[PDB]
C-alpha cells in the first residue's frame, strides 16, 4: 500500500493558449490509427451493442473516422456486418474480439470478410490472457492490425507492445456507463492515464487510444494534446439514428437505449456497468460537425496546424472546483439551445 | 502549540492502479486472519449495533464465511443467550460486544461460558485508560480468550493496545454513516489514511487491524483491504437485510428498515448524542447482498493481480483523485433506467 | 503574492490522543482576560438580534458572558447593563462603536458597573481602534478592553501595544456576513485563529473566535487552536432569550436574525451583511447544554482535563471534500431529529 | 504535454487585511486605461451587442469609466453611435474593431467621430492577425489609443506590447456566457491569468484589463489587487435599462436578453457562447454605486488610498471549498434583498 500521486481527468485541466499563425479552418485532423491505418478524423465509436453495428460503422467511416462492430452477435452475424460495411464504398471497418474459447474462430471469420483492424477489448488489458491472445492472433496473421485494451498504466503499454499490438486502448473506469471504480475500487483518472500511456507509447512507437470520459468537444482536444492518436466515444454517438436500438419516447422527449457491456442486460462475474437511456440527438453528421468544429477551434488557440504539432506544444494547467464553475456558463438563465452545449 | 500535520483521505478520495494479472476473479481467495487463532473465510464483519446484528444476522454471517458481533445493548443474560443460540447452531464463529463498565467482567463471564469465539471491547474512545486497563484485566482472567479493542485512529493507539494484550484492533473514528462525532466533537481521522497508519504499525507489532465504517460499496472494501486491513466491518450495508433486527416499515409503497447509531438518542435510551436515527431501503436476504460484495472484491483483486489478500496489500498502489475525477468515476450523464444489484 | 492556503473549521479534524480523563471530568474554566474568568468559554454576539439584557443575564448564569449591542441610546445601554449587573453579580459586556461620542458612551457603562468593554469595528486594525483603545485605557487603566476584529498576528501586536486586554478574531466568517463577497477581504477562520493565538501567546493576550461556528465540534477546534473563548450569533439567535418576537412563517416558528452591517441594522456605507430568519430554538439552556456536551466530549477524546492542556496537545489534520462527506451523516434518510445535529 | 501549475480564479482566493489609516470615503479610484487616457473609476462595460451602446456609453462615461460600442453593426451605424456619445458633453468613448476585411475603413470612420479608444478584440489576441492588425492601426494613426485582446499569458502581453498596443485585455474563457473552455478545452483561470499578465505589463509599461468572470464587487477588488488597471463586465451591466434590448416579463419578473458574441444569435457554424436572459437591475447609476462602495470598502481594509498602493501591498490567500462556503452567507434564510448581494 502506497499513495503514488494525484491523478487528473479532463475537467481538472485546461490547455493554455499559444501564439497562433493558423486559424481553425487551416489545421488538419489526419491521424495514424496504426502504421498502416490512418484516419481523416481522430474519432472512433465504441464497440458496444447499443452504439455500433453495421449502419454506424458505415457512417463513421463515411465521415473519415472508423467504427468498431461489437462482439455481442454470433460469429456468422459479426462477419456479415463487417461484410456490409466493406462492400459499400470500401470503407474502413473494425471488429471487436473477446478472449474466448472460440477466439480464433471469429478472428478467422472477419479476416475473411476483409476487416481492416481487429481490436480485442477486455476489462483488464494488462493480463495473461490478452497478451497471449495478441501473440496468438499476431502469429496467424502478422500483417493484421491488432488493437488491445483496456489498460491504464505505462507498464501495461510495454507488455502489449512486446506482445505485438499495433495500437493500445487506454481507460479503466472513465466510461459514462461504467462502475468499475465503484464495484472494484480500481482505475486511473482518464487524463493522467492517457498522457502516462501516450508518452510511453511515443517511446516505443505505438499509438494509444482514449476510451470513455468524453462529454464535450473540448475533452477530446485535451486527450489529443495529451498524446492520444484518437478518441473513442459511446454516449456522444448512442443518441444518433445510425446507432442500434429503436427510439423510445418518455415525457415527450425522444431517447435511445444505452448500456455498458458489463451491465446485467448486455451479458445475456457481478456487473460492472449500468443501463439507462440517452437523449436522441438526430443524425450523426450533425454531431460530428460540432465535434470537428470544436477541435479545430481549440487547435487554432494553441497554434497547431497538425495533431503532431499539438502534442509537442501543449501545456496544461490545473483548475479547482472554483475554476470549473467559471469554465462553464454561469450566473445566467440559458433560454436557447446550443448545438455543442447542454 | 497547535500543529497541522497532513492531509488525510477516505475511500472516495483514492483509486487503486491495475497491475499485470495472471489471475481471474473466480480464482482468488479471500481467507484472512481475524486473529491468530480465528481465521475467517470471507473478510466481512457485521456491526455490533441493535439494528444490525443479533443472533439471526450472526448465524447468517458465520454461515457465509464471515463473522457477526452481537451488540451489547441487551442484558448480560439476554446476550449470553444470543451468543449461545449462535454457537449451538452448528459450530459457527461468534463475537460479543462489551463496554468499559462495572459489570464488564460479569458480561465477559457470561459470553465466555456461552463459548464465544471473540470479544469486542468497543467504545467511543478506544485509546484511553479505561479500555487499556480493561483489556489487561480481561486477559488476566482469560488468557486464551481473543480480544478485539476499539475504536482507534492512530498508530500510537495500536502500540498501547498491543502492549495491553489486544489480539486485534478496530479502527475508525467518525466514518460511520450514522456518526456525528466529527461534527459535535470535531475529533476523527479520515478512514483510509487512518486504516493505512494503524495497519502499518499493526504489521510491525504482529497484530491485525479492522476497517470499521465508511464503506458503502465493494470498491471501498478493496481499498480497505489493500490498505492493510484484515476485515471490514459494516452496518449500513447489512442493515437493509432481512436478517437485521429492524422491522420492515413501508413508506409510499417502498419498504424500509430503521437504522440508528449506538450513540443516537434512541439507542442510548435503554444526553449528548454522537449519532443519528433513521431508515434505509430494504434489500432482501443477506446471502444475496454478500454475493454482490464478494463478486466485487474478487473482481477488484483480479485487477491488482492478487491471488490472496496478503498479495493485495503488498502489491497495491494508490492514486489520489480529485472531486472532478470522483464524478467521472460514478456513472455520469445518463438516466439509469434499470437497477443494478451492486450500485445505487 | 499568494502566501498560503488558509483553512476553516470544516477543512480540519482533530486527531485523538491518549486519554486518562472522561468527558464529565474535564473543566471548561477559561481566561477571557487577565482578570475576567468564565466557567464556560462561550460568548453571545453583540448584535441587535442576539444579545440584550435578557440574553446577557442568561449567558452569565450558564457560565459564559453576553455582550450588549451598541445599536441604541447611551442611556439605554447603561440601563441594560444595570439590569444585568443588579441581577446578582453577573459578568456583563458592552460593545462600543468607534464614534465621536465613544467616551461618553463608555463613561455610562463603567458607571453601571460593566465588567468588560469590546471595541468592535469592521476593521479593528486601523487608526481609529488603536487610538480609541488608548483613549479608553488612559481614563480607565483597570478597565478590561476587547478590540477587534482582526485576522493577522501583526494586528495582535498593534492592539496589544495599544493596551487591549484581549482581541476578537474574525473577518467575514459570519453566517450573515458578505464582507468576503462585497469587499474581497477576509481570512479563513481556523487559520486566522491559529495565527493570532500563537502571537497572542507570545504577548500574553487571549484571542476570541468570532463567527462561523455551526456545531459544537467547531468550538472544540477553535479552543484547540488557542482561542480563549468562542463567540456566535447564529446559534443563539433563535433562542427565546434573544430579542425579537416569534414570526410564524409557513406554519413554523422563527426569530429575525441579521448582520449589524445589513441594510436593516444600519438604520454612507454599502451593506456588508444580510437579513434573515432562523428557527426558534426554544430556551437558551437547552442549546448550551448540547454545546458544553460537545466540547466536553472532544476534550475527552484529546485527553484534555483543562483548556490549556488542550492547546498544548492538539494535532490537526486536513480533510478533503470527500472526508467532509463521510464526516457528516451519509447514505441514510434521517427520521428522528438530533438535538445537536441538523440539516 | 506537461501540467504547469494550479491556476486560480477569484472564488479561490481572499485578500488579507492590512493596517489602515484610511476610511473607504477617503480613497481615490483613478487609473490609467492607457498612458494617455485616465478613468475616475476602474469600471468598463463589455463590448457586446446586448450590453453597451450609445445609451450605455454615455451612462458609463457619466459615472466615471468607459463604455465600448460593440462591432456587431454597420460601419456607418457605429460611427454614429460614437457620434452620439462624443457630442453628448465630451465624454470618453470606445469603439470595437475586429480582425476583418473591412477593419481599416471601419477604424477610419470611428476615428473621424473622435473615438478616444479602439479595442481590437478577437477570441484569440495572441495570433498573427491581431499582431499584424495592431501594427497597421498604429501605422495609420500613431497617436490613437488601441487596446488588444484577448490573452491569458505573459508572452502574449510582450507580443502585443511589441506591436504598439497601449493596453491588453486579459481573459480566455471566464465570461458568464462563455463556452470556449468547454468546446475547445482552452483557457486560463482568470485570477492567475490576470496576475501573471499584470506582472509582465508592469515590467514593460502596459496596463491590463481584467475581463470576465466578475460576479461581485469583491471580485473586482481581487482583480485590482493583482495588477489589473480596470475591470470589464457584461453580466453586471446587461441587466440595466441603459443596456440595449426591451424588458421582458416571464414570471411577472423583469428580465433582459444577454447573449455571447459567439452564440448562434449574435453570429447571425460552431458557437463559443450561449444566449439567455438576465435579471433586470434597473438604472446603471444605482448599480455602479454599489460596485464603487465595494471597491472603496475593500481598499479601506487593505489600507490603500490609491490603486497603486493596493497592488504594492496586496497579499492573497487561497481558500478551499469549505472556505468558499464560509465566505458566502450560510445557515440562514435570507428574508430581505441586499443591493450588492443576490
Ligand atoms: C462483468 C464484466 O464487465 C465488463 C464486461 C465487458 N466490458 O467491455 C467491460 C469493460 C470494462 C469493465 C468491465 C467490463 C466482466 C468483467 N470481467 C472481468 C473483471 C475483472 C477482471 Cl481482472 C477480468 C475480467 N469479465 N467480464
Ligand atoms: C465562435 C466565435 O467566438 C467569438 C466571437 C466573437 N467574440 O468577440 C468572441 C470573444 C471571446 C470568445 C469567443 C468569441 C469565433 C471564435 N473564433 C475564433 C476562435 C479561435 C481562433 Cl484561433 C480564431 C477564431 N472566430 N469566431
Ligand atoms: C454519545 C455516545 O456515543 C457512543 C455510544 C456508544 N457507542 O458504542 C459508540 C460507539 C462509537 C461512537 C460513539 C458511541 C457516547 C460517547 N461517549 C464518549 C465520548 C467520548 C469519550 Cl472520550 C468517551 C465516551 N460516551 N457515550
Ligand atoms: C457595512 C457596515 O458593516 C458593519 C457595521 C457595524 N459593525 O459592527 C460591523 C461588524 C462586523 C462587520 C461589519 C460591520 C460598515 C462597514 N464599515 C466599514 C467598512 C470598511 C472599513 Cl475599512 C471600515 C468600516 N462601516 N460600516
Ligand atoms: O459495461 C461496461 N463497464 C465499464 N466500461 C464499459 C462498459 N461498456 C463499455 N465500456 C467502456 O466505456 C466506453 C464508452 O464510454 P463513454 O463514451 O464515456 O460513454 C466504451 O468504449 C468502453 O471502453
Ligand atoms: O452512534 C454512533 N456514533 C458514531 N459511530 C457509530 C455509532 N453507532 C455505530 N457507529 C459505528 O459505525 C459503524 C457502522 O458504519 P456504517 O457501515 O458506515 O454504518 C459501526 O460498526 C460502529 O463502529
Ligand atoms: O453585518 C455583519 N457583517 C459581517 N459580520 C457580522 C455582521 N454582523 C455581525 N457580524 C459578526 O458575525 C458574528 C456572528 O457570526 P455567526 O455566529 O456565524 O452568525 C458576530 O459576533 C459578529 O462578529
Ligand atoms: O461568445 C462569447 N464567448 C466567450 N466569451 C465572450 C463571448 N462574448 C463576449 N465574451 C467576453 O466575455 C466578457 C463578459 O464577461 P461576463 O461579465 O462574466 O458576462 C466580455 O468582456 C467579452 O470579453
DSSP code per residue over A103-165: HHHHHHHHHHTT-SEEEEE-S-SSBHHHHHHHHHHHHH-TTSEEEEEEE-SHHHHHHHHHHT-
Q: List C-alpha distances in Å: A257 to A253, A340, B269.
A: 13, 21, 51
Give whole-number Cα distances, B203 to A42, A211, B44, B155, in Å: 50, 39, 20, 11
- Is the minimum CB–CB distance between A10 and chain D shorter than 8 Å? yes
- 3-class secondary-structure state, position A297: helix
- Grid cell in block for residue D114: 473622435
The CA-atom distances, in angstroms, between D308 and each of C142, D116, D218 are 43, 24, 17
C95 Cβ under 8 Å from any chain D Cβ = no
D111 three-class SS: helix
Distance CA D15, CA C188 (A): 11
Q: Coil, strand or helix: which one is D291?
A: helix
List the domain boundaries for chain C.
1-343
Cell 469549505 belongs to residue:
D322
> Residue C177, Cβ neighbours under 10 Å: how many?
27
Are residues D112 and A8 in contact, defined by beta-carbon separation less than 8 angstroms?
no
CB count within 10 Å of CB D315 equals: 17
Task: Decide whether any atom of ligand 4 lies within 6 Å of the D32 Cβ.
Answer: no
Q: Are D93 and D57 in contact (CB under 8 A)?
A: yes
Beta pairing, strands A117-121 & A66-69: unpaired
Of B1, B35, B242, B251, nearest in space to B144 by CA? B35
Using CB atoms within 10 A of its CB, is residue A33 exposed (0-12), middle (13-18) or buried (19+)? buried
d(CA B230, CA B210): 6
- 3-class secondary-structure state, position B340: strand
Question: What are the helix and strand counts (H, E) for chain B?
Answer: 12, 17
CB D131, CB D163: distance < 8 Å: yes
Q: How many residues does chain D have?
A: 342
Distance CA A209, CA A226 (A): 11
Q: What is the DSSP string of B206-262?
A: T--EEEES---SHHHHHHHHHTT-SEEEESTTTTTBTTSSS-EEEETTEEEEEEE-T
Residue D172: closest CA among chain A residues belongs to which residue? Answer: A17
Fold of the domain spanning D1-342: TIM Barrel (3.20.20)
A254 in contact with B, Cβ within 8 Å:
no
Contacts of D67 (CB under 8 A, 6+ apart): D44, D45, D52, D53, D56, D57, D58, D59, D60, D61, D85, D93, D94
CB A107 within 8 A of CB A118: yes
Positive/negative CA dihedral, B241, B245, B247, B250 = negative
Task: Report the alpha-carbon distance of residue B297 to residue B283 in Å, rounded.
Answer: 19
Give the single-character DSSP code of D304: -
Q: What is the DSSP letter of A14?
A: E
Q: Which residues of C touch B155 (CB under 8 A)?
A: none
Pairing of β B32-33 and β B39-40: antiparallel
Dist CA A23 CA D270 (whole Å): 14
* D25 CB within 8 Å of a chain C CB: yes
Residue with cell 461460558: B113
CB-count burial class (<10 Å; 0-12, 13-18, 19+) for D138: middle
SS3 B332: coil
Residue D300 · residue D20 · CB < 8 Å: yes
Between CA B322 and CA B18 the distance in angstroms is: 19
Residue D303: C-alpha distances to residues B8, D16, D55, D290 (Å):
38, 11, 36, 20
**β-pair partners for C146:** C118, C166
Q: Can you tell me whether residue B181 is helix, strand or coil? A: helix
> B99 with B123: CB under 8 angstroms?
yes
Rounded CA separation D215/D70 (Å): 21
Query: Which long-range contacts link B21-25 to residues 24+ away (Cβ below 8 Å)?
Result: B21/A124, B21/A126, B21/A127, B21/A128, B21/B302, B21/B303, B21/B304, B21/B305, B22/A127, B22/A128, B22/B305, B23/B301, B23/B302, B23/B305, B23/B306, B23/B307, B24/B302, B25/A269, B25/B295, B25/B298, B25/B299, B25/B301, B25/B302
B245 beta partners:
none
Which residue among C155, C264, C272, C275 is best mutated to probe the pocket of ligand 4, counting the most ligand atoms within 8 A of its Cβ? Answer: C272
**Phi, psi of A146, rounded to the nearest 5 degrees:** -100, 135
Indicate which of D129, D150, D185, D192 best probes the interface with A, i.e. most A CBs within 10 Å of its own CB. Answer: D185
User: Kind of pairing, strands B254-260 and B277-281?
Assistant: antiparallel
User: Going along D160-253, which residue ranges are E strands?
Assistant: 167-170, 208-211, 230-233, 248-249
C:156-195 residues touching chain B, CB 8 A cutoff? 194
Ligand at shortest distance from the CA of A178: 5
Cβ-contact C290, C340 below 8 angstroms: yes
What is the gyration radius of the CA atoms in chain B, in angstroms? 19
Q: Is D286 helix (H, G, I), strand (E, B) or coil?
A: helix
List the grid coordinates of B161. 493496545
- Give CA angle at B152 (B147, B156), nearest 5°: 100
Cα D86 from Cα D94, distance rounded (Å): 10
Please give the resolution of this entry in Å, rounded to 1 decimal. Answer: 2.9
Q: Are the CB atoms for B236 and B280 separated by under 8 Å? A: yes
CA-nearest residue for atom 24, ligand 1, is A123
**In which residue are the cell numbers 479547482 written?**
A320
Q: Cα–chain-centroid distance for residue D163? A: 22
Gap from D190 CA to chain C (nearest CA, Å): 15
**Residue in D closest to A316 by C-alpha:** D3
Grid cell digits, residue D320: 478551499
Per-residue three-class SS string for chain C: CEEEEECCCCCEEECCCCECCCCCCCCCCEECCCCCEECCCEEECCCCCCCCHHHHHHHHHHCCEEEECCCCCHHHHHHHHHHHHCCCCCCEEEEECCCCCHHHHHHHHHHCCCCEEEEECCCCCEHHHHHHHHHHHHHCCCCEEEEEEECCHHHHHHHHCCCCCEEEECCCCCCCECHHHHCCECCCHHHHHHHHHHHHHHHCCCEEEECCCCCHHHHHHHHHCCCCEEEECHHHHCECCCCCCCEEECCEEEEEEECCCCCCCCCCCCCCECEEEEECCECHHHHHHHHHHHHHHHHHHCCCCCHHHHHHHCEEEEECHHHHHHHCCCCCEEEECCCCCCC
Apex CA D264: angle with CA D263 and CA D269, to 5°? 105
Among A52, A119, A113, A60, CA closest to A83: A113
Cα–chain center distance at A145: 17
Of A153, A275, A324, the CB nearest to B324: A324
The CA angle A229-D269-D273, to the nearest 5 degrees, is 90
- Residue B322 CA to residue A321 CA, distance in Å, equals 9
Give the C-alpha separation, B12 to B28, whole Å. Answer: 25
| Cα B240 versus chain centre, distance | 16
**Structure-derived torsion over alpha carbons of residues B35, B41, B44, B45, reported in degrees to the nearest 10:** -50
CA distance C194 to chain D (A): 15
Question: Subunits that touch chain A (at least 3 Cβ pairs < 8 angstroms)?
Answer: B, D
CATH number of C1-343: 3.20.20.70
Return the closest-CA partner of residue B48 out of B66, B65, B70, B67: B70
Tell me which CATH code domain B1-344 carries.
3.20.20.70
C-alpha cell of A158?
510495454
Q: Is D152 on the interface with A (CB under 8 A)?
A: yes
Which of the residues D154, D183, D266 would you substitute to probe the A interface, choosing the one with the greatest number of A C-beta atoms within 10 Å?
D183
- Measured on CA atoms in the order D332, D333, D339, D342, is the torsion positive or negative? positive
Q: Which of B3, B128, B189 sits opposite C19 (nearest CB)?
A: B128
- Report the distance separating Cα B26 and Cα B35, nearest Å: 26
Measure B291 CA to nearest chain C CA, in Å. 21
Check A156 against B20: CB less than 8 A apart: yes
- Joined grid coordinates for residue A121: 477489448
β-bridge partners, D316:
C2, D15
**Which H or E run includes D42?**
none
Breaks (C-N over 2.5 A) in chain D follow: 268
**End-to-end Cα separation, chain D, in angstroms:** 41
Torsion of the alpha carbons at C299, C305, C307 and C308, rounded to the nearest 10: -130
List the one residue out of D32, A70, C342, A186 whose CA is nearest residue B11.
A186
Place of cell 446587461: D238
User: Which residues are CB-neighbours of D263 under 8 A, at least 6 positions away?
Assistant: A336, A338, D177, D271, D272, D273, D274, D275
Q: How many CB atoms lie within 10 A of CB A212?
A: 24
CA B68/CA B92 separation, integer angstroms: 10
Is residue C338 packed enough to be buried (19+ CB in 10 Å), middle (13-18) or exposed (0-12)? buried
Q: Given CB atoms, is B6 within the 8 Å cutoff of chain A?
A: no
Amino acid at each position: 500500500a502506497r499513495i503514488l500521486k494525484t491523478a487528473y481527468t479532463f475537467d481538472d485541466v485546461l490547455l493554455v493558449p499559444n501564439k497562433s499563425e493558423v486559424l481553425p479552418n487551416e489545421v488538419s485532423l489526419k491521424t495514424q490509427l496504426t502504421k498502416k491505418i490512418q484516419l481523416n478524423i481522430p474519432l472512433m465509436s465504441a464497440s458496444m451493442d447499443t452504439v455500433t453495428e453495421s449502419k454506424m460503422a458505415i457512417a463513421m467511416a463515411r465521415e473519415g473516422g472508423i467504427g468498431i462492430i461489437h462482439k455481442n452477435m454470433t460469429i456468422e452475424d459479426q462477419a456479415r456486418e463487417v461484410d456490409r460495411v466493406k462492400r459499400s464504398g470500401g470503407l474502413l471497418c473494425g471488429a471487436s474480439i473477446g478472449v474466448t474459447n472460440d477466439m480464433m474462430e471469429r478472428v478467422d471469420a472477419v479476416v475473411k470478410a476483409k476487416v481492416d483492424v481487429i481490436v480485442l477489448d477486455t476489462a483488464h488489458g494488462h493480463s495473461k490472457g490478452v497478451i497471449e491472445g495478441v501473440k496468438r492472433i499476431k502469429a496467424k496473421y502478422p500483417e493484421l492490425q491488432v488493437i488491445a485494451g483496456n489498460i491504464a498504466t505505462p507498464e501495461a503499454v510495454r507488455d502489449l507492445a512486446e506482445a505485438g499490438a499495433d495500437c493500445v486502448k487506454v481507460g479503466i473506469g472513465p466510461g459514462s456507463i461504467c462502475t468499475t471504480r465503484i464495484v472494484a475500487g480500481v482505475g486511473v483518472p482518464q487524463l493522467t492515464a492517457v498522457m502516462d500511456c501516450a508518452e510511453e507509447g511515443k517511446k516505443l512507437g505505438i499509438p494509444v487510444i482514449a476510451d470513455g470520459g468524453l462529454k464535450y468537444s473540448g475533452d477530446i482536444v485535451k486527450a489529443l494534446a495529451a498524446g492520444a492518436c484518437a478518441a473513442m466515444m459511446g454516449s456522444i454517438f448512442a443518441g444518433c439514428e445510425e446507432a442500434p436500438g429503436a427510439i423510445e419516447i418518455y415525457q415527450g422527449r425522444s431517447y435511445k437505449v444505452y448500456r455498458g457491456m458489463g451491465s446485467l442486460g448486455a451479458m445475456a462475474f457481478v456487473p460492472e456497468g449500468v443501463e439507462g437511456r440517452i437523449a436522441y440527438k438526430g443524425h450523426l453528421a450533425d454531431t460530428i460537425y460540432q465535434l470537428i468544429g470544436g477541435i479545430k477551434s481549440g487547435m487554432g488557440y494553441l497554434g497547431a496546424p497538425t495533431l503532431e504539432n499539438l502534442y509537442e506544444n501543449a501545456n496544461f494547467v490545473v483548475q479547482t472546483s472554483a475554476g470549473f464553475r467559471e469554465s462553464h456558463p454561469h450566473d445566467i438563465n440559458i433560454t436557447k439551445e446550443a448545438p455543442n452545449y447542454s
